[PDB]
Design a protein around this ligand. Structure first.
Ligand SMILES: Cc1cc2nc3c(=O)[nH]c(=O)nc-3n(C[C@H](O)[C@H](O)[C@H](O)COP(=O)(O)OP(=O)(O)OC[C@H]3O[C@@H](n4cnc5c(N)ncnc54)[C@H](O)[C@@H]3O)c2cc1C
Ligand SMILES: Cc1cc2nc3c(=O)[nH]c(=O)nc-3n(C[C@H](O)[C@H](O)[C@H](O)COP(=O)(O)O)c2cc1C
Ligand code: SF4
Ligand code: SF4
Ligand code: SF4
Ligand code: SF4
Ligand code: SF4
Ligand code: SF4
Ligand code: SF4
Ligand code: SF4
Ligand code: FES
Ligand code: FES
Ligand SMILES: [Zn+2]
Lengths: 235, 67, 1178, 118
């Protein structure tokens, strides 16, 4: 039952973001053709991002769709602070994913970002260097999402908590065997079973950190240490 | 005190869809939401008390303890 | 409409459009799990158990929300769906803090419902307790006498004071059952299958018991002269008397089991014969070959096996003892042999065990008792030689041993000590070091290395096809309840095999609490355990009389009342437990932080437990959408969400009306309704449909009982499936122990018990004396309005027999509707509320009748318009378009004048159908029309169809007459969807009025005050308690006869008090407020054996009235037909019931619009007083 | 789908949408005469026996063709309906050449089924 057909008090409502409403008058005054000439074939126009983290120059950037992430990180963001190696970008926010260093050339686009697991989300790209540890980052955003759940459906209300304790056990080194398979199964079951988008995008960090940084988790749980040396319990 | 909420309840009257604004105003005034103030809101505006407590405890901004 | 073609689980269905997948699967016998779905509420989507895989869609679709379309292929059991549901159930269990079955049940090898029958004992239901035992244990008394009771080692009351005496209680109820005729469980129809059981021991007899219940033909071949096994030829008489065993075996034989004794396998009968003439064979031969001493000289005369010696003793065969007896062993056999030898005249008996006391397999109590009797013990001593002189044993040489290292058991291994040897002088040596399976009996079978029969675990099947085994023959020597459990499991497996599909035993998964500690019970009251009566050692060491004696009934109840009720009360109706059993859920992997937020409450009816809440929201949605009170709500957000009442207050301090819908809709026992019994116990009840009698809405309900006690009440899913506080919770008076069951008559100025015949004779003679001395119309009959139609008609007949026209009720109000329309009845039915255009709810319609409030809420949601006329606040004022707060009937006169002024009355038709119109116009010609009256008249005139709902018990008759006038003027009477509906105060007010009880309280009181009425026959009313001013009026009666359920304050001043039974103990017919005739079924048999109709029929036969239920029903039907009221949904369709066949418009003077009156019905008044005392609403 | 509220012969019914009055009356134990109605065929309207009186409509409505709507009051035995059905039956009989019972049965005072047992 959609808001366009039944929204506020049962009457049709159109709920849109601020950015699309801001893009509308430009579309009207310059015509649709001018707007459609910017961006890829799937995504037209420009998108706003909030560069932060270990980037040299944070803030708001309005980039055409399809501009490579490497260009945004280096050319616009000014590179990594203190000229350290660039590990991953936490794109989308607490419900986004960690796009790794080798996928730095995936163009900015809904389809191209989503094909890497992450989501466009709140356009908040958190640039991170090789110092940062992936388990803590995944546990950091999952904690926020678990705190921000509303608690209606079982998969998001209690599944996110089980994932958070699993991640905490992994980071503390006190994790039992079978933690990686159980965590992955829990994440894919929460993602495919939750009702709203806060649960379907809740395990996006974990999943992404299990697609590109599985070795980080494996060294965390087996060797009882982290290569990034950021977990306080392991330093 | 309960008269402090009298203007707010007078401004947001006639519609029971403005309970969150009234709760925020009470939170600003008393620095917290006492059960007597929530009872006064429930009586004055005509919304069920359980709804008031649910909307009050839903958000982390609303605290039910004295500061 | 269009028929959509769908395919669910490879089965083509032609469903209707606009239906959800859940409804289609329910109506086509396809099971889809659901926890947060109710038909009366909009879809929620929380639990996510109803996910089904739809072809063409990538995501699993919820069956509770998705609507079936054309060409839909739905798979409700695909592996993706199963994995999704299993993960959801595991996630729900991860936050669940409960106990599906108590530790006592889990510790019992037979898994007997220990909590169930303990709680049934605590309620006085001994036969139900025995029946519960026999569902898993065919020998309550015998096993209760002889059992180490591991259940008491796991009893949670060990954490408070002392474990519950479960074995003693079971022995007590078994003795009670055996004292009278025993209990035989129902037997299924004969299946024509023959099963051969070899052995008459606990395992074989248990298999026979649980296979004869399935309808098979059972023959038990027993080698010994009498069945019983080691329960007879083992355990001695002082521990298990053989009369009890004989009685239990006779009970088993009463089920159709043919026990052929003296038949031995391999000697008298052959295994091939059994395999040929029988479908299945179950071998329960047991371990009947005692182990030899294993030392040189063990074959010398004077050395006898333990079980052989005990069999000789039990059979009264001559055995050769002496002054000196040695016993080698440490088990039950050794201790029994030692104590038997002590009682058989041996001067000294010494038991030699190779281990120490701590590692004795025998119970500590048995060893201590034997020490009291005079048995000596030598530990860490093992035999090595038998010193025999002339072929007879003179002594035995033992080698002292010491605890050296660990062993297979893991505790401690004894090893011999070199140079340590001791000679023990003994005329007799009994080797009781254990028993082994007799190899001769088990010929032709594959044997485990231990010597026992080898069977497939979980199926109890031997190497030979169709031959099963169990008991000591398979597991070796164990306790008797293990053999009984093996027999029961083998019986179930054998039944499955006979049906064709052999299925191994599957153990269910239970949710259990393992974090419990004694600190959780620091607040529980400490109660001493039941004392054990044990015979004196000196007097008992000489005879074979039983040592311990059975508890008394008082002690049994006091012991069973010590139970902590550890198991979940919702076990037999929990759906989460069913679903986690249906799926291979592994909860340990996802186990983590779990809330502990349960705090005890003082609410007498509803108990809420946050630890078992799956947050489906059903309670909130049903309190907000159906009931309309909105007393529950969500609190916090996320993992911390909790369902709480208004402001987290106790349920009594909120606006909750104690309807119990939240308890009835909860799936996982978090919200429950407390049973109306002495001790709470989770039992499998039986539900019977009956009709509530506490007001005229006539809500049907399912009363769930177990024995003669009512255990719960559930609403019927007819319309909104709702019950108010009365119907749901005031059924507690049925179990009330203050009910009188025998009549009382005045002897020496005090009421004392008598027989029914004498009491009814006294009643008849007193009434006849009053009639003779004071003439006709001198006896008043004040009958309650909760009686059936037949009872009211019989009371009218009896009043005619007594020549008295004073037939009335104190609950009856002055009638106005029969002087206007002709009949005092509701014109229309409850089914036209939904389809009417305007509803005028007058009085406390929603407050007094919560079900009518829900009906009005649903009708307004469907499109109706509600106008509430009252004096104070009403719950229906939320959705009312117009609300009027009035105190005088001048409002209705002004409304009539406003209707006349705006020409909203068609004077031609009204004058055609209604006489008395010009005088009504003259009466309303002078009143002043107010704004409210004008608005009400505009609303009424603009409505095509209108229904006036009047709360008869809170609205004055002037208001009813004025509303009838208003309906008649606007022509809203005698047509479909238009009319007036009176919600009567009691269950059968309409039926009582139709039968002839039509005298109000005021008339009867006036007649008494004048002195015209000198005697009263009050049937289930409480004039003294309800009204104080009536206390003087009742002082004017020469004779008072009371027929009441309880000894009320008005029954204590009577001359004869006759007991009545509840409405669940009396069958008959009642009449709803709209005139619908409903049936009162018999949920329970009458406690005193006499129904209300039976008592009144006896009293009437004393007057020469020959009647019964069928004759009275026929007369009632004829009476209803003569008034054109029988099975008529709308009244006055053809013409009104006045003799003129016209409406006599109500013309009168102003008066208060609403009145407040008491309740004179005994049970309703008592429950209202209870609710007032507890500060509850309704 | 929606549940329609109708009233047939002073009995309130909650029927389903897209149903004819004939189906609703059949499933609610109300007898409506019909001669040219079959469930597998489209409505015909020839015999005119299933006419019912619907409140708010001036003409009698065929129950085999009219669809139940919300707030429908149907009278299937009103005198107008009875007269219409009686006239239709008389018209049908006027062109009928048959023998319901043979003269042998009618001549017997006990009306024994002479043709039957013969
Ligand atoms: C001395 C003693 C004391 C005990 N005390 C206790 C106690 O206090 N508490 C407790 O819980 N348990 C006690 N037990 C254990 C209990 O008695 C047995 O474990 C239980 O009876 C096992 O029963 P069963 O059916 O496996 O075999 P049994 O009862 O040992 O024998 C079953 C039947 O098989 C029959 N049978 C054998 N061979 C054949 C054949 N070839 N053909 C036909 N029938 C045959 C026998 O006649 C016998 O009737 C005691 C046992 C003994 C020996
Ligand atoms: C947890 C959560 C938070 C969201 N927050 C926002 C938000 O802040 N702003 C927004 O425009 N959409 C947000 N959305 C998405 C909205 O549900 C919805 O898709 C959006 O209003 C559509 O706007 P659009 O048509 O302009 O894309 C959020 C969704 C989820 C699940
Ligand atoms: S997934 Fe969405 S709807 Fe479900 S509990 Fe989380 S926030 Fe609430
Ligand atoms: S609520 Fe259900 S699942 Fe939970 S303990 Fe009780 S019976 Fe078991
Ligand atoms: S049979 Fe034994 S273990 Fe089972 S409940 Fe009775 S005493 Fe306890
Ligand atoms: S207290 Fe009652 S329910 Fe709990 S373990 Fe003991 S007998 Fe069983
Ligand atoms: S019992 Fe009380 S809380 Fe529960 S549904 Fe009824 S009114 Fe609401
Ligand atoms: S208490 Fe309410 S929300 Fe919790 S399981 Fe029961 S019905 Fe559902
Ligand atoms: S509304 Fe009346 S009939 Fe229904 S449950 Fe309550 S008292 Fe009984
Ligand atoms: S003659 Fe035959 S067809 Fe004609 S009405 Fe009679 S039975 Fe029917
Ligand atoms: S999601 Fe449909 S029943 Fe719960
Ligand atoms: S059945 Fe003949 S007209 Fe309808
Ligand atoms: Zn680390």
């Amino acid at each position: 039952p959609f808001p366009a057909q039944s929204g506020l008090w049962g009457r049709p409502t159109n709920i849109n973001n601020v950015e699309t409403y801001a893009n509308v008058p430009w579309i009207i005054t310059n015509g649709g053709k001018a707007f459609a000439s910017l961006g890829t074939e799937k995504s037209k126009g420009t998108k706003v991002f909030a560069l932060a983290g270990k980037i040299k120059r944070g803030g708001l950037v309005e980039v055409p769709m399809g501009m490579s992430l490497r260009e945004v990180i280096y050319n616009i963001g000014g590179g990594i602070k203190d000229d350290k190696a660039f590990k991953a970008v936490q794109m989308g926010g607490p419900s986004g994913g960690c796009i790794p260093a080798d996928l730095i050339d995936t163009p900015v686009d809904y389809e191209s970002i989503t094909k890497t697991g992450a989501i466009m989300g709140s356009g908040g790209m958190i640039v991170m260097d090789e110092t940062t540890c992936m388990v803590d980052i995944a546990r950091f955003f999952l904690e926020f999402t678990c705190k921000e759940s509303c608690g209606k459906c079982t998969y998001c209300r209690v599944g996110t908590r089980r994932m958070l304790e699993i991640l905490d056990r992994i980071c503390n080194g006190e994790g039992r065997d079978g933690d990686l398979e159980l965590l992955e199964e829990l994440a894919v079951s929460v993602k495919d079973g939750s009702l709203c988008g806060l649960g379907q995008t809740a395990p996006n960090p974990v999943l992404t950190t299990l697609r590109y940084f599985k070795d980080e988790y494996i060294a965390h749980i087996r060797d009882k240490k982290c290569p990034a040396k950021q977990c306080k319990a392991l330093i | 005190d309960l008269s402090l909420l009298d203007p707010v309840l007078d401004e947001y009257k006639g519609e029971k869809s403005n309970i969150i604004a009234i709760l925020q105003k009470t939170q600003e005034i008393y620095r917290f939401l006492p059960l007597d103030a929530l009872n006064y809101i429930s009586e004055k505006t005509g919304v069920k008390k359980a709804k008031i407590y649910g909307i009050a405890t839903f958000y982390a901004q609303f605290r039910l303890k004295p500061v | 409409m269009r028929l959509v073609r769908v395919n669910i689980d490879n089965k083509e269905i032609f469903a209707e459009e606009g239906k959800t997948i859940l409804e289609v699967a329910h109506e086509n016998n396809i099971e889809i799990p659901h926890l947060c779905y109710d038909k009366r509420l909009k879809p929620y989507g929380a639990c996510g158990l109803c996910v089904v895989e739809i072809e063409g869609s990538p995501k699993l679709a919820r069956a509770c929300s998705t609507y079936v379309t054309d060409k839909m292929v739905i798979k409700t059991d695909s592996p993706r769906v199963r994995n999704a549901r299993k993960m959801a159930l595991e996630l729900l269990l991860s936050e669940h803090r409960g106990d599906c079955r108590p530790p006592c049940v889990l510790a019992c090898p037979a898994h007997t419902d220990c909590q169930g029958y303990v709680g049934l004992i605590a309620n006085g239901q001994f036969r139900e307790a025995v029946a519960l035992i026999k569902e898993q244990l065919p020998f309550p008394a015998s096993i209760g006498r002889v059992c180490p009771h591991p259940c008491e080692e796991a009893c949670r009351r060990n954490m408070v004071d002392q474990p519950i005496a479960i074995a003693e209680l079971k022995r007590f109820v078994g003795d009670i059952d055996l004292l009278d005729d025993g209990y035989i469980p129902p037997i299924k129809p004969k299946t024509g299958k023959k099963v051969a059981i070899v052995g008459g021991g606990p395992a074989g007899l248990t298999c026979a018991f649980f296979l004869a219940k399935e309808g098979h033909d059972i023959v038990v071949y027993e080698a010994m002269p009498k069945a019983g096994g080691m329960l007879r030829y083992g355990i001695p008489e002082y521990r298990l008397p053989k009369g009890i065993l004989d009685k239990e075996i006779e009970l088993i034989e009463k089920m159709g089991v043919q026990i052929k004794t003296n038949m031995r396998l391999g000697v008298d009968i052959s295994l091939e014969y059994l395999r040929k003439n029988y479908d299945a064979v179950f071998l329960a031969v047991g371990a009947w070959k005692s182990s030899t001493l294993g030392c040189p000289g063990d074959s010398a005369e004077g050395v006898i096996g333990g079980i052989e010696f005990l069999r000789k003793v039990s059979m009264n065969q001559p055995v050769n003892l002496g002054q000196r007896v040695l016993v080698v062993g440490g088990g039950n056999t050794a201790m029994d042999a030692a104590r038997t030898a002590i009682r058989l005249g041996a001067k000294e008996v010494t038991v030699l065990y190779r281990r120490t006391r701590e590692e004795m397999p025998a119970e500590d109590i048995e060893v201590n008792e034997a020490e009291e009797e005079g048995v000596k013990f030598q530990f860490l001593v093992a035999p090595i030689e038998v010193i025999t002189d002339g072929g007879r044993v003179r002594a035995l040489k033992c080698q002292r041993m010491r605890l050296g290292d660990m062993d297979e058991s893991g505790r401690r291994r004894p090893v011999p000590i070199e140079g340590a040897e001791v000679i023990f002088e003994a005329d007799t040596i009994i080797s009781a070091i254990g028993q082994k399976v007799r190899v001769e009996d088990v010929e032709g079978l594959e044997l485990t290395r231990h010597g026992t029969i080898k069977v497939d675990e979980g199926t109890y099947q031997t190497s030979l096809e169709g031959v099963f085994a169990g008991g000591d023959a398979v597991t070796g020597p164990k306790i008797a309840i293990e053999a009984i459990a093996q027999g029961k499991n083998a019986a179930r497996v054998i039944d499955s095999y006979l049906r064709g599909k052999l299925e191994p035993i599957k153990e269910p998964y239970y949710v259990k609490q393992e974090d419990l500690t004694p600190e959780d019970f620091k607040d529980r009251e400490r109660k001493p355990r039941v004392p054990l009566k044990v015979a004196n050692a000196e007097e008992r060491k000489n005879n074979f009389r039983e040592i311990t004696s059975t508890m008394t009934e008082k002690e049994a109840i006091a012991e069973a009342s010590r139970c902590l009720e550890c198991g979940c009360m919702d076990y037999f109706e929990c759906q989460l437990y069913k679903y986690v059993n249906q799926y291979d859920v592994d909860p340990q992997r996802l186990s983590g932080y779990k809330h502990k937020r349960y705090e005890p409450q003082k609410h007498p009816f509803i108990e809420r437990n946050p630890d078992k809440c799956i947050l489906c929201g059903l309670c909130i949605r049903v309190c907000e959408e159906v009931v309309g009170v909105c007393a529950l709500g969500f609190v916090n957000r996320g993992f911390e969400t909790i369902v709480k009442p208004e402001f987290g207050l106790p349920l009594e301090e909120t606006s909750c009306i104690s309807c119990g819908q939240c308890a009835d809709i909860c799936p996982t026992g978090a919200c429950i309704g407390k049973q109306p019994v002495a001790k709470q116990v989770p039992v499998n009840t039986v539900a019977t449909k009956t009709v509530c009698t506490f007001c005229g809405m006539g809500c049907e309900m399912l009363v769930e009982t177990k024995g003669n006690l009512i255990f719960d009440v559930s609403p019927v899913q007819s319309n909104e499936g709702m019950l108010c506080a009365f119907g749901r919770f005031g059924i507690k008076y049925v179990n009330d122990k203050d009910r009188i069951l025998a009549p009382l008559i005045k002897v020496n100025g005090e009421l004392s018990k008598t027989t029914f015949d004498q009491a009814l004779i006294e009643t008849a003679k007193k009434l006849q004396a009053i009639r003779a001395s004071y003439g006709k119309d001198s006896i008043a009959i004040i009958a309650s309005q909760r009686l059936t139609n037949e009872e009211a008609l019989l009371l009218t007949k009896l009043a005619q027999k007594l020549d008295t026209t004073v037939i009335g009720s104190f609950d009856l109000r002055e009638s106005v509707l029969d002087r206007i329309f002709g009949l005092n009845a509701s014109t229309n039915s409850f089914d036209e509320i939904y389809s009417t255009d305007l509803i005028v709810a007058v009085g406390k319609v929603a407050e007094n009748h919560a079900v009518m409030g829900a009906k009005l809420k649903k009708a307004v949601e469907l499109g109706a318009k509600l106008v509430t006329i009252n004096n104070g606040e009403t719950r229906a004022d939320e959705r009312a378009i117009a609300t009027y707060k009035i105190d005088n009937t001048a409002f209705f006169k002004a409304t009539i004048k406003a209707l006349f002024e705006m020409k909203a009355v068609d004077e031609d038709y009204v004058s055609k159908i209604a006489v008395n119109l010009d005088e009504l116009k003259d009466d309303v010609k002078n009143v002043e029309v107010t704004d409210e009256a004008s608005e009400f008249a505009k609303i009424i005139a603009g409505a095509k169809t209108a229904m006036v709902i009047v709360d008869e018990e809170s609205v004055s008759d002037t208001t009813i007459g004025q509303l009838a006038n208003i309906l008649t003027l606007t022509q809203k009477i005698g047509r479909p969807r238009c009319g007036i509906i009176k919600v009567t105060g009691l269950g059968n007010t309409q039926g009582a009025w139709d039968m002839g009880i039509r005298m109000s309280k005021e008339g009867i009181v006036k007649l008494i005050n004048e002195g015209k009425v000198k005697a009263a026959f009050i049937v289930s009313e409480d004039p003294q308690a309800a009204d104080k001013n009536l206390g003087e009026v009742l002082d004017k009666l020469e004779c008072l006869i009371v027929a009441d359920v309880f000894l009320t304050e008005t029954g204590k001043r009577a001359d004869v008090v006759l007991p009545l039974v509840s409405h669940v103990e009396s069958t008959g017919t009642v009449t709803r407020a709209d005139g619908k005739i409903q049936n009162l079924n018999l949920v329970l048999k009458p406690k005193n054996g006499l129904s209300n109709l039976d008592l009144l029929l006896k009293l009437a036969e004393l007057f020469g009235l020959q009647y019964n239920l069928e004759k009275l029903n026929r007369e009632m039907v004829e009476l209803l037909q003569n008034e054109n009221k029988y099975n008529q949904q709308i009244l006055y369709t053809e013409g009104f019931a006045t003799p003129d066949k016209t409406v006599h418009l109500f013309v009168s003077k102003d008066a208060p619009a609403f009145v407040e009156k008491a309740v004179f019905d005994t049970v309703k008044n008592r429950f209202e007083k209870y609710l007032q005392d507890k500060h509850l609403k309704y």
